[PDB]
């Protein structure tokens, strides 16, 4: 900088140090692989993420559980109020007259305005649970929208009702809570660090923020296998699995993710093993032609329905059956990412 | 009664449309028919700012008209000297997902926000040498799409939660909320006098909001797709919008009607950003066709192109004196044109 002054040269020296720092940050950044977890109804419940966290070894201190107390009580009320509206929908009268008044009291309860379980409500909810009609409507979960864990909570109303009540780890796990915004989970395996970007709680036009993740390694999906019979009340008789299939097709058809792998996780493997015995998949999906009492055949049919949606026929759709007690979900994500990278390399070296 | 209400709303909409129709003596293109065309506009990259390693989403020029800030998805906010291409500062962001950027009119402060739903204010003129976060403003439930300093202590932010908020930076609390809009609000623009602003939303409506009262004075609905960009005319009595539909639309504030549309049969992509020239004669729009266009705003005929970039032009900003035009892009380079 012969024409430069003494201070101009010092400014150029600062811009060179800044460039060095930017390059070092970029080197550090590319060693991280971005995985985009898409938010479905199974992901909206957000219990699987908690349980998978327990597997990594992260736990809850007492402070965290005091965090979830209020959410536990809020869940009892939410489930109960939904069950009442389901009764009104299904035209099932209560076996006991006193239950009608208890139902009304339950209806007027405001869900967010509740921080402490109240003594009149503890008895109202208990007596409502004791109603045989209520047990019958609980038997018919699949026709309406209900928490998966209503039975466990309503069975143990006494311990929750105690003024001194600390939620157990199990109570913490099953508090279905919606999420405010992008939550990122960093995990490191075999010298490779990944970031799982959960976008489930965004709740805003996806057309206006989807291109942010245009360049990612994989778009992970999570769908439940026990969803074939469930029809939600808010939809007018729409199957939830057909809703998850439409979402899967819509996402994978996105031009932003044309270079991104698709990983699919099928969840609630145990719940299907019990559900298949009393519920026939053929009734909800006419194509199914199998033993009609086999969970293995139903799983393969469901996975076939999902994989058939691929609009390329050249791109792999990795798959796994996860039981909520799986300890191989991280290894599968690594092996699917390693094979994504292998195929990308083969494409760039003109071998494939 | 919901029936009487919806009928009343339809009747009021009918009255509004009749009022606008009555006050339309002539088109803007009829009045400016006998005016001399701008002519071909030829502009060249006088500088190229390299250093961002990801897509650049937002840029904001400084009032001095030499310093500019830019935001990128690699988690970096970079203040640059335009004249010498020198990097004055590089700020690491906590959330890499940033969609908007602003520079304080004094020059002491920058603001950034994104998919984390927080607007962060950093101080540049602090006395330990480093640039540190002054305050984190967290009240919105949707992503922050735009933020524009009103003073050193007042900032107005737009959010994908359908609401715009006016904050007090010192206290940390939003003093005013504008809630009329139904779709996500994508862009915000402040009037020269900083007493009114306009916001454009995903519902194809743009609304003029009074900053002191907190209500909506006017609403305009000429577009048929999401409005992604909005900018005031220098006078302050007009503004322009850019939409996913290829057209840019100019709307008056006193006549309360759309004045012109800037469209070309070939142009079918979205408009990422829009801005004016200092005289208000040129309207510069950035497109997803990888190139920026320059329209004579009074005859609505295209006059120039800016074809340097090879990806989507994400941000376009002109200087306060009109010396140059910076354009950022998803290819991670800024270019200054003159």
């Amino acid at each position, epitope marked *: 900088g012969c024409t430069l002054s*003494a201070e101009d040269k*010092a400014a150029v020296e600062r811009s060179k140090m800044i460039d060095r720092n930017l390059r070092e940050d970029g080197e550090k950044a590319r060693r991280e692989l971005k995985l985009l977890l898409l938010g479905t109804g199974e992901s909206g419940k957000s219990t699987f993420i908690k349980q998978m966290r327990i597997i990594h070894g992260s736990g809850y201190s007492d402070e965290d559980k005091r965090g979830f107390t209020k959410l536990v009580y809020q869940n009892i009320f939410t489930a109960m109020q939904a069950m009442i509206r389901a009764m009104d929908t299904l035209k099932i009268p209560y076996k006991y007259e006193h239950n009608k008044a208890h139902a009304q009291l339950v209806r007027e309860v405001d869900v967010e305005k509740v921080s402490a379980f109240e003594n009149p409500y503890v008895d109202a909810i208990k007596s409502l649970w004791n109603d045989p009609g209520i047990q019958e409507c609980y038997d018919r979960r699949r026709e309406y929208q209900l928490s998966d864990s209503t039975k466990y909570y309503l069975n143990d109303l006494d311990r929750v009702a105690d003024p001194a009540y600390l939620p157990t780890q199990q109570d913490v796990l099953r508090v279905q809570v919606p999420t405010t915004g992008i939550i990122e989970y960093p995990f490191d395996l075999q010298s490779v660090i990944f970031r799982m970007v959960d976008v489930g709680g965004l709740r805003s036009e996806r057309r206006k923020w989807i291109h942010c993740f245009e360049n990612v390694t994989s778009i992970m999906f999570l769908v439940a296998l026990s969803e074939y019979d469930q029809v939600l009340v808010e939809s007018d008789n729409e199957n939830r699995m057909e809703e998850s299939k439409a979402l899967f097709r819509t996402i994978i058809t996105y031009p932003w993710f044309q270079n991104s792998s698709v990983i699919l996780f099928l969840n609630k493997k145990d719940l299907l093993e019990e559900k298949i015995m009393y519920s026939h998949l053929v009734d909800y999906f006419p194509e199914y032609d199998g033993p009609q009492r086999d969970a293995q055949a139903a799983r393969e049919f469901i996975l076939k329905m999902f994989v058939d949606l691929n609009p390329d026929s050249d791109k792999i759709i990795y798959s796994h059956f996860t039981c909520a007690t799986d300890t191989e979900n991280i290894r599968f994500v690594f092996a699917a990412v390693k094979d994504t990278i292998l195929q990308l390399n083969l494409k760039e070296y003109n071998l494939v | 009664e919901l029936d009487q209400l919806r009928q009343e709303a339809e009747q009021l909409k009918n009255q509004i449309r009749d009022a606008r129709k009555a006050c339309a003596d002539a088109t803007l293109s009829q009045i400016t028919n006998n005016i001399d065309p701008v002519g071909r506009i030829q502009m060249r990259t006088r500088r190229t700012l390299r250093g961002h390693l990801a897509k650049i989403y937002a840029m904001h020029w400084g009032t001095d008209s030499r310093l500019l800030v830019s935001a990128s998805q690699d988690g970096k906010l970079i203040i640059w000297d335009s004249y010498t291409t020198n990097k004055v500062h590089a700020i690491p962001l906590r959330s890499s997902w940033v969609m908007t950027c602003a520079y304080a009119p004094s020059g002491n402060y920058v603001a950034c926000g994104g998919l984390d739903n927080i607007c962060s204010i950093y101080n540049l003129k602090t*006395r*330990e*040498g480093n640039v540190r976060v002054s305050r984190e403003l967290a009240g919105h439930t949707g992503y922050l799409s735009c933020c524009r300093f009103l003073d050193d202590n007042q900032i107005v932010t737009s959010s994908g939660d359908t609401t715009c908020a006016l904050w007090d930076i010192e206290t940390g609390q939003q003093t005013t909320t504008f809630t009329g809009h139904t779709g996500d609000v994508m862009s915000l623009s402040l009037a020269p006098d900083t007493r009114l602003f306009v916001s454009g939303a995903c519902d194809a409506s743009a609304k003029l909001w009074d900053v002191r009262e907190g209500m909506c004075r006017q609403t305009f609905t000429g577009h048929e797709s999401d409005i992604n960009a909005i900018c005031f005319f220098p006078n302050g009595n007009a503004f322009a919008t850019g939409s996913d539909d290829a057209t840019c639309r100019l709307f008056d504030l006193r006549a309360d009607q759309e004045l012109m549309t800037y469209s070309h049969d070939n142009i079918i992509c979205g408009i990422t950003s829009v801005s004016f020239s200092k005289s208000g004669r040129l309207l510069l729009a950035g497109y997803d066709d990888f190139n920026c266009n320059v329209w004579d705003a009074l005859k609505a005929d295209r006059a120039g192109v800016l074809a340097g970039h090879d990806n989507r032009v994400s941000c376009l900003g002109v200087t306060d004196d009109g010396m140059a035009v910076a354009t950022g892009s998803w290819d991670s380079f800024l270019k200054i044109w003159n």
Partner: single-chain antibody, 236 residues
């Protein structure tokens, strides 16, 4: 807040060697370039050395070039100045001075307390001259100090690299004005500066007792950094 506290001075036998060190606190030391400046026992003050941010650049004064060495431990936040072959012109007070250079910054803004060093017994550059050494003025009257330069301090980029400092009796120097017009942060708006290419003037309106002291002009257009003789303001 920002504190630079140097250590290492004392009584040194002639021909020996001494190492000085300024410890920094309360600021991003690694991003600041450093200077050592020194003041004779009764004379003005002269620039000694300059180490850059990141240690990429080092400049020494003609007089000490080759017998002095400057180094910075950026992680430990310290600045060292090795001195060898101590001559009797090395009796002085050594002041650590931080400075940062980007568009719009203020160099030489913070000076250290200084260490005393005692040892028992202007070619091809710019010389900056102040033709006055004693101006006693009563409080309340405008005072104009003048300073002249060998060549034009106005660079082609549009900046005139003249800095004005002040030295209160028993106190370290402190920056008043940088680049001929700008005021440093925390100085009263009473002080103003206005100069042509070679001639410069600092005006103190509404003089107050705190302003009394020795005023030094300085140039930064080229190294070596040359100060002035200093103009002293006293009470009547």
């Amino acid at each position: 807040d920002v504190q630079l506290v140097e250590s290492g001075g004392g009584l040194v036998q002639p021909g020996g060697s001494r190492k000085l060190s300024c410890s920094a606190s309360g600021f991003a030391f690694s991003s600041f370039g450093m200077h050592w400046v020194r003041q004779a026992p009764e004379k003005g003050l002269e620039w000694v050395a300059y180490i850059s941010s990141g240690s990429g650049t080092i400049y020494y004064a003609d007089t000490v070039k080759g017998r002095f060495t400057i180094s910075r431990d950026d992680p430990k936040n310290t600045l060292f100045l090795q001195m060898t072959s101590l001559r009797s012109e090395d009796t002085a007070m050594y002041y650590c001075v931080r400075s940062i250079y980007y568009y719009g910054s203020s160099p030489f803004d913070f000076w250290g307390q200084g260490t005393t060093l005692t040892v028992s017994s202007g070619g091809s550059d710019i010389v900056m001259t102040q033709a006055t050494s004693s101006v006693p003025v009563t409080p309340g009257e405008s005072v104009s100090i003048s300073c002249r330069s060998s060549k034009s301090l106005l660079h082609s980029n549009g900046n005139t690299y003249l800095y004005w400092f002040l030295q209160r009796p028993g106190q370290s120097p402190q920056l008043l004005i940088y680049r001929m017009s700008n005021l440093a942060s925390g100085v009263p708006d009473r002080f103003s500066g206005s100069g042509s290419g070679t001639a410069f003037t600092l005006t103190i309106s509404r003089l107050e007792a705190e302003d009394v002291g020795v005023y030094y002009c300085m140039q930064h257009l080229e190294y070596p950094l040359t100060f002035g003789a200093g103009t002293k303001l006293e009470l009547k």
